[PDB]
Structures are given as C-alpha cells and as structure tokens.
RNA sequence: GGAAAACUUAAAAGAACUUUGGAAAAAGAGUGAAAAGAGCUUGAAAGAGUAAUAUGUGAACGGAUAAUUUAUAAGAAAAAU
RNA sequence: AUAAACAUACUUUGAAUCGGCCAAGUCUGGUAAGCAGGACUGGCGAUGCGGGAUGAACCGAACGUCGAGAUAAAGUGCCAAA
RNA sequence: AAAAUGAAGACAUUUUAACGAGUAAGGAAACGAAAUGGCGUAAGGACAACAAAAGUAGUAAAGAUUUAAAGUAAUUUAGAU
C-alpha cells in the first residue's frame, strides 16, 4: 500500500542524538515524520560545555567569503534538522527524498496540535542517561546562541496547554458516563447471552 | 474489499559496504521484529504492485506486478530475503510490498 | 545547393534562396531564427523594426560580448542585437518568394514562413599585418539562405 | 527441438577511451599500457574479453531459429544442403541480383529450406 | 524407396531439376507436430498416481479460508477431495456466501478449527465428469471466429446444470444455520485487523 | 632553392522563354537514363544548420541491475477408447 | 619418518635484466631523518579483490564466465549489510 | 595429462581428472589425435553450377550511411537508402 499518514514525535523528553538515528533510518524505509518540539530535546553536558561547542562550531566558516561558508542555524528545529541530516545519504535522489519527509515545529501547529503523538524508546531520556548527569534542552541553548523566538513559542505552549485542560475535563466527563452506561448494559438480562459469551473470553 | 497481506518495506538489496548484489532483495515485514519469527513466512509468496499511467492508445494494463518468494531470514531483527522472477526496481526503495497468506501450510 | 528540406505539397508552397551571401553567418543565423514560425505580414512587419532599431533579435547561441538591452525582456535571452545588414538580405528573399507565391496564385496572406535555414559557406582570404613581419587571415564569413512559405490550416 | 543458447555476456567489448575520443575506435584493442586503468582490471572498468565467456560448443554459431547459416550464390549451391535442412539455413549473398534470387527463393521451397533473405530485393 | 530426409513437394510448373519428381507423382503429406501422447482415462473410482497428499488438519466437512485467487477471503466448507485432480472440491454455500461448487488446489487454504461436518451430503455427482461438463471452454481456432456471444449463450447452457448440481447445499446450510453466529462468521470476508500478526494467528 | 593542381555526360543536348530583383541570382519551364548544373563520377570524419525525440542544482562520459517507452520477434496443428 | 611418473636428468638456442623500494621481537655511521649502508625472510615493482574513511608495500587472500551456500581480515546507533 | 576410437563425421573426435593472476620477455609456418589457435590489407598461381555454356554483376559491382545477426575477441554476415 502506501503511508499518506504521519507520523508525529513529541521531542519531549527525548535525546537529540537518539531521536536522529531512529528517524533517520525511518526516513529511508518510506515513512513520514513530524516533529513537534523540537525544542524540548535535551543533549550532554551544561549551558557552558554546550556554549564552547556551538562556539567551535561557529568558527567553520570559508574565509574568502563566509557567505559560500558553513550556515550555522540557531533555531532548535533546525538544530535537529543538521543532525537528521548528518545521518542520511549525502548527493543523491534517495537522501533528498528522505529528508522531504521531515518536519520540526518549535511547538504544536495548528494541523499537528490534535494528532496521535509517538515516542522512541531508545531515545528516552530515562533509560540512556545517569540522572545525575546535567543536560542542556534544545530550547535554552538556542536563546544564549542568538535564537530570538524562545519566548513567542513559550506563549503558544502555554495557551495549548490551558485549551487541552478543557478539552480533556469535558472529555473525562463524558467517558466516565459511557463507562458507567455500559455497566448497566452489561449487567442487563437481556444481553446475557452476549454477555457470556464476552466472560467466556475474559473481554468482560 | 479485505485485507490479506502484510505490508513489507523494500529496504534495499543484500550488499555489502561497497557492494551491492540486486538478486536478493531485503524487507521488513509488518510485526516481525525477531528471527524467531521468520520462519512462518519462509516461503510465502510476495508482489510488488505498482501503477504506470499507460495512455488511452496501449493495452498494457495500469497496474502491473512482480512476484517473489521469502526464502531466509536476514540477522536477528526479523529482516527477510526475497528473490523475484525480476529485480526489484531501486527506485522502489522505501516503498510497501504485499507478503501473502500463501502457499499455506496451515 | 538543395534544400534541407521538401515542402508537403508542392502544389502550395513557394521557395527562395540565396546562395555565398555576403552577410555574417552569426549575426544571419540569429536573425533568421527569429522569423521562424510567424506569418509572412508579421515578419516583413519585425525585419523592418530591426532595421530601424525597433525591435531586437535574441542572439542566443553567439552572445559572447553582445551587450544587453532593455527590449530583450521576455525571450529568456539578456543579449540582443539589430543586425541591419541581415535583415535586410532576408527581406529582399521574402520578397522574392512571396513574388513566386503569387505567380504561383497562393493568398499572400495565408502564408507563413515555415521553413528557413541558414548555412555556412566557403570564406574568402585578406591579410592583416601583424607586428614582428607576421600575416594573419582576414576572412569573410558568408552563407547560404533557404525559404520556404506554406499556406497555414488546421489539423 | 531447440537446444536453449546461452549467452554469458549479451554486450559489446568495446574499446578503452573509446567514448571519449573519435578517434580511437570501438573495435577492441587489449591496453597495454604500463599504468592502464584496464589492463590493471581495477574496479568498475574490469571488462576485458576472455575464454569463459565463449558460449556453449553445442549451440555455438547457431541462429536464433536453431539452424546454422550457410551461403549459397545460385540454385545449385542450394543441393549441397538438401540432405541437412534442419540443421543448415540458406543464405542468399548480397550480390545475387533479383532475377537469381527468385529462382533460388523457388527452389528452396521444392527442396523445403530454410531461407532467410526470403525478403530481399523485392519489386516495388 | 525415398530417403528419409526427402520430402517431396509440388512445384508451380517452376523449372525443376532433371532428378526432381514431376507433380503428377507426387502427393503431399499434411504438416506433423503433434508427438505427445494425452493423459489416459481410468475408472471414475480408481484415483490417479498423481494425488496430491492432504494436511491432517483438511478433513471433510471443515471450513476453510480462501487466500488467493478469486474467491479470496471467502470461507467455504470441504466436501471431499477430486481423486482425479487433487484439487479441493469445496461448496461456500451459494445460499449463504454465493461461493458456488468449484475446485481449488489446497494450497490457497486454510484449515480453521471450526467443524460443520455434515454427512449425507449427496456427493453421487460432482467429480471430474462434472466439473468438465460445466467448465467454460475457449472457441478453439479453425471453429469460425464467434466473437462476444459465444461465451455468453456457455454459461446459460451450463447454468441449469450447475444450478441442479447445488442440492448439495441443502444440508450444510441448515446446520450452519443452527450454531449461533456462524451464518455471519462464512456470510462476512476474512480480514487481517490492526494487531493480527500471521505469525501469532492460530485459527 | 623550388611547389600545388587528375575525373560532368554516350553525346553540351552546358538550361535561354516568363515573373521578381539595380544586378548577381531565385521561382517556374526545359535537356538528359539520371542534374550528374560546370566549385559538376562517388562524396567519409572533424565543424555547422533544419526537423523529430529526451534530460538537467558547481564538469561530462563508462559499467552491473531493474522499471517505463519504442523497435525486433515465436503457431496451425489438434485427446482417450 | 614424509613427500615425489604430466617424477627425475637434462642438452641446445636465445630474450629481457643487473637505477630498485618497503616491512621487521635486526645491525652499523649519525642528535636525528619518509637519512646513508648491510645479514635472513616475505612483499611492492609485475597486483587486481574484501578490510583499515582515503594510501605501492599493512591485515585476509592472489583473479577463466556465472548460480547457490559456509567463511577470512574486520565489524553490528545512522551514513552502512549485520 | 592419461586412456578409447579413428579415412573423413566435426564442433580441432569421446571420457575422466587437475589446472587458468601477471610488466619486461618467449611461444615463425607445416606436423589426425596435429611441437599454441585465429582475424584483416594488397598482389601472383589455381579452384568455384561436373550433364558440352560451369563463382557474382545494369532484374544494379565496388564504395558510403545506418539496422540486425554470428563470434570471448580481432572481425564477418545480411536488410534498407
């Protein structure tokens, strides 16, 4: 057949680098990714290794004209867009294709706000990282580097945040009274025999 | 109308890291994520089904297939290989194969 | 010199041409190129605005060097020229052929100039005194001309 | 019966810089030069001719028909194949007129071989 | 006598050579290729030496899934095997899911655990004397052209015969009809759902 | 001291009159088996022009494997008893 | 003890060659050199193939044209098969 | 390489077994079980419709452009113009 659906990461809580690698080889098996916050990534190491990372990665630069040079995006979506990037194939139909299937949003847009959002397990912060070791999210390295939408994005989340909590307050009351309706069918004489036969199965 | 076949993901051929040998073809089927469960579909049968948009004038049907077997397993994550009556296109890669419920042996 | 190529039918068609015309062959090629395909009203219309500047001609393939002008606006070519010379070589065919169409007993204005076709022909040598008692060649770039004007129908 | 012919390369050896350079032709010519990319049989450009890839000696020189080609000029050349037409085809050659060849084309037919220039130098 | 690769053939009054028999002696031959012997017709009891081995899991009166061909994703019920053939000779109760008696290789099935049984099934007909009879040949080539109707006047001369031979459908059919949900279960396709792996699938 | 340059046709029958053009020429017309039309037997490659087809982000070309399009291309016999 | 009959012993005529280079559980002169010069063996030259990203010599292993398998050096987060 | 067969088939026989990288360099012709096997250019002497009109050719040669076929290859063959 063929994938028209997406499939939505939430960038929460999730490795950088493991995040890449996962979707990375994804991407070349046909599937379609978008990222949402991917700002929330976190890398090793504090504010102050980070800085003199970035600060040697700045210096790449052609010195004849660093408008020919390496382009060093600040913008936490693009941040993860060179590091998927790094991992597929470089000057050939299939990496370009691969990587047009790709998509990082500094929050939830409007279309990817009420989509059923997937998780990478290897990538989890959990599992692959000593708690105490001190981590960096994409989003405030981003800020001291020069990005100047940390705090527009910072409101949207916000007013995301408060319109699912209404959401999902009508919804749980509206569940809790199918539950509770389906108790009575259940317990019905009427549908006994439909009843036994889902006992039977431990459905019930 | 049903649903009879598990979608299979063309990764791309038996190679090696500057090789590359187009007679055997690897996929990743839907739900196999060991070798232990390989050995249902040793065997079964698997078509590529693509669409050419033929003219008004020409005969040649608008879909068309190429048929292959499952004969091995392929390293301990349930990756499989499939040798076809003719080479899978590369230009397929990424795209989704059918991996039949026959020849059953149920 | 035949021609390149033989018209549909004889019967309404009419033909000139011009053989080791004293004319560049870039700057006839170019000019040539553009009258392709347009109504025999309209190009003696376009080859008399080239003549008094009016209107360009796209040099496409030979532009190296050819300045840029503000009439090359919409022909996917920067570089343009109004080679006078030329135009005026293919203005006296046209003319010629369009005599023969009408001695045939064709509509003058139903034909098109569907076929034209420039080729290169043999130069002749002049010598240029170079410094340290050298000589150079100072040759002549000629060509031949061939025109052809068919009836417009549809199909 | 037709024996399966099995070509083991269906392409052309052709000539090293050959597609580069006009005027070194396609006919094949062994490199034999002290640093060739070819001779040396790197990757990618190692196709040279060599004894495997002769065909099979049982379907060796044999026409697609399953018959082996065999030239004849006249009518009489024809009566040195009559005892082995289904192994041997006619062949008329290319400067056997038309009136000649109708006559070979005629007997071919009261003699039941094969020809394959049956359609040549046909009238108008 | 002639020698064997001597064949002769009539000329058009073309010039012929002085060894070369004139017409008047010579008679044609009509063209040979035809050297295969046919298959043999043996008792209508006795099975051919070509039969297939059935899975212990296909017994009579089993319902089986139909993978490929067709009928894919229909269930039909398993009356008995074509000695003949090999081939199933199953009935998907036309009354129930308009699969009609035919034959299928037991490759393209699957034998579920659910069982319908049914003796007394009234199989006298219904072998390869029968599936012959009502199969749907081609016009063959020297038969005239016939084009479109000829396939259309086959099938309404087979159909009474294939219509009178689905008596057999009268006794399945009242025992499907008296186990709960099982007229829905062969009535309905067969799916794969979200979640069913073939692997994990045991029916 | 010291070159280059052979060939129309069987026969010049080497167009001959009309229209356009200052003229050269062109288009008809005509000769001839055939323009082979005098830069004349045939007429290659390099270089161009026209037509048809197809492709495209800092070289191009080659090879193995398939897909698409086009082309080539295999037959008139015939079962059981 | 083991191996050896397409074994063994050769005879005649003749080609090219005697600028070499590298490695090291080696040595000499030198502070040292991708330096200069030697003993033993293996290679490059004359040599492609798989690996070390790339490389005359390193590791595996030497090549008629193909199909199927088990391997060697070495590897299994993605580029990249595991 | 060894066995078997051997006046003529034919594909330079039949079978079995081992082997096949390579610069400089060598392997002239002939040699029936052949002491390497072949392609091409030009000229000379023969042979080429076996029954007293005996290779092809104005019913279109050589040459040129291409389309296909045979050969591992050098190249050969045929169609169309």
Redo the contacts with the bound molecule.
């Keep these: 057949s063929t994938n028209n659906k997406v499939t939505v990461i939430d960038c929460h809580g999730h490795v950088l680098?493991r995040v890449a690698?996962?979707v990375?080889?994804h991407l070349?098996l046909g599937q379609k990714f978008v990222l949402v916050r991917c700002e929330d990534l976190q890398v090793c190491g504090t504010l102050k290794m980070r800085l003199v990372q970035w600060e040697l990665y700045q210096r790449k630069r052609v010195n004849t004209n660093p408008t020919?040079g390496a382009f060093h995006h600040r913008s936490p979506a693009d941040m993860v867009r060179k590091a998927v990037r790094?991992?597929?194939?470089?000057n050939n139909y299939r990496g370009?294709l691969a990587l047009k299937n790709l998509k990082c949003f500094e929050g939830c847009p409007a279309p990817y706000d009420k989509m059923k959002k997937s998780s990478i397990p290897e990538a989890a912060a959990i599992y692959s990282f000593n708690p105490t070791r001190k981590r960096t999210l994409l989003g405030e390295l981003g800020t001291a580097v020069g990005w100047k939408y940390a705090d527009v994005v910072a409101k949207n989340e916000a007013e995301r945040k408060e319109r699912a909590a209404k959401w999902y307050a009508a919804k749980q009351l509206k569940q809790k009274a199918v539950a509770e309706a389906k108790e009575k069918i259940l317990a019905d004489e009427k549908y006994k025999a439909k009843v036994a036969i889902l006992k039977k199965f431990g459905y019930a | 109308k049903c649903r009879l076949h598990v979608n299979a993901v063309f990764?791309?051929f038996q190679?090696?890291?500057?090789?590359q040998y187009?007679?055997?073809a690897?996929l990743q089927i839907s739900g196999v994520n060991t070798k232990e469960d390989t050995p249902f579909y040793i065997g079964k049968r698997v078509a590529y089904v693509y669409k050419?948009n033929?003219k008004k004038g020409?005969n040649?049907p608008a879909i068309?297939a190429?048929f292959g077997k499952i004969?091995?397993p392929?390293?301990?994550?349930g990756?499989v290989?499939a040798r076809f009556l003719?080479?899978?296109?590369?230009?397929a890669m990424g795209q989704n194969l059918k991996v039949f419920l026959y020849p059953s042996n149920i | 010199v035949?021609y390149?190529?033989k018209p549909v039918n004889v019967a309404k068609a009419?033909?000139?041409?011009?053989?080791?015309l004293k004319v560049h062959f870039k700057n006839t090629?170019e000019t040539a190129?553009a009258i392709?395909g347009m109504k025999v009203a309209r190009a003696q219309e376009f080859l008399k605005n080239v003549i008094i500047k009016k209107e360009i001609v796209p040099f496409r393939?030979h532009n190296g060097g050819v300045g840029r002008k503000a009439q090359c606006k919409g022909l996917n070519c920067a570089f343009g020229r109004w080679p006078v010379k030329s135009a005026q070589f293919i203005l006296?065919l046209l003319?010629?052929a369009v005599?023969?169409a009408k001695?045939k007993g064709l509509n003058t204005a139903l034909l098109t100039v569907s076929?034209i076709?420039?080729?290169?022909?043999?130069s002749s040598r002049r010598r240029l005194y170079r410094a340290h008692g050298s000589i150079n060649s100072f040759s002549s770039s000629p060509c031949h001309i061939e025109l052809i004007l068919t009836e417009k129908e549809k199909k | 019966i037709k024996p399966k012919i099995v070509?083991?390369?269906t392409?052309?050896?052709?000539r090293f810089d050959s597609?580069?350079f006009?005027r070194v032709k396609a006919?094949?010519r062994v490199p034999?030069g002290?640093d060739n990319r070819l001779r040396?049989?790197?990757?990618?450009?190692?196709?040279l001719?060599?004894?495997?890839?002769?065909?099979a000696?049982?379907?060796?020189?044999?026409?697609?028909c399953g018959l082996y080609?065999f030239?004849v000029?006249?009518?009489?050349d024809l009566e040195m194949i009559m005892m082995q037409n289904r192994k041997y085809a006619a062949?008329?050659?290319?400067?056997?007129?038309?009136?000649?060849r109708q006559e070979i084309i005629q007997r071919a037919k009261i003699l039941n071989i094969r020809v394959?220039?049956a359609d040549?130098?046909?009238k108008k | 006598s002639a020698p064997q690769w001597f064949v002769p053939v009539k000329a058009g009054d073309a010039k012929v050579?002085?060894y070369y028999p004139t017409d008047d002696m010579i008679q044609e031959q009509?063209?040979?290729?035809?050297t295969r012997?046919?298959?043999?017709?043996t008792a209508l009891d006795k099975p051919a030496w070509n039969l297939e081995k059935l899975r212990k899991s296909i017994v009579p009166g089993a319902i089986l899934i139909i993978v490929a061909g067709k009928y894919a994703g229909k269930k039909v019920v398993f009356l008995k095997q074509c000695i003949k053939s090999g081939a199933l000779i199953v009935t998907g109760p036309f009354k129930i899911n308009g699969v009609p008696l035919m034959r299928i290789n037991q490759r393209y099935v699957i034998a579920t655990s659910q069982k319908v049984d049914v003796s007394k099934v009234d199989t006298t007909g219904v072998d390869v004397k029968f599936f012959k009879k009502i199969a749907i040949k081609k016009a063959?080539?020297?038969k005239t052209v016939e084009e479109d109707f000829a396939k259309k006047q086959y099938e309404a001369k087979k159909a009474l015969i294939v219509e009178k031979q689905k008596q057999v459908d009268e006794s399945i059919v009242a025992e499907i009809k008296k186990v709960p949900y099982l007229k829905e279960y062969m009535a309905s396709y067969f799916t794969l759902k979200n979640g069913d792996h073939p692997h994990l699938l045991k029916f």
């Design positions: 680098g690698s996962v990375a080889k070349l020919r790094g991992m597929l194939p470089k370009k | 990764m791309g190679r090696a890291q500057r090789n187009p007679n055997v690897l050419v033929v020409s040649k068309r190429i004969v091995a392929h390293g301990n994550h990756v290989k003719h080479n899978l296109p590369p230009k | 035949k390149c190529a009419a033909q000139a041409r011009g053989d080791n090629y190129d392709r393939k006296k003319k010629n005599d023969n001695a076929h076709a420039v080729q290169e022909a043999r | 070509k083991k390369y392409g052309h050896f052709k597609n580069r006009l006919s094949w034999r002290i040396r049989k790197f990757k990618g450009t190692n196709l001719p060599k004894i495997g890839y002769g065909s000696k049982a379907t060796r020189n044999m026409l697609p080609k030239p000029r006249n009518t009489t062949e008329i050659s290319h400067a056997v007129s038309a009136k000649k394959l220039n040549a130098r046909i | 050579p002085a009509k063209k040979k290729l035809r012997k046919g298959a043999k017709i063959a080539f020297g």
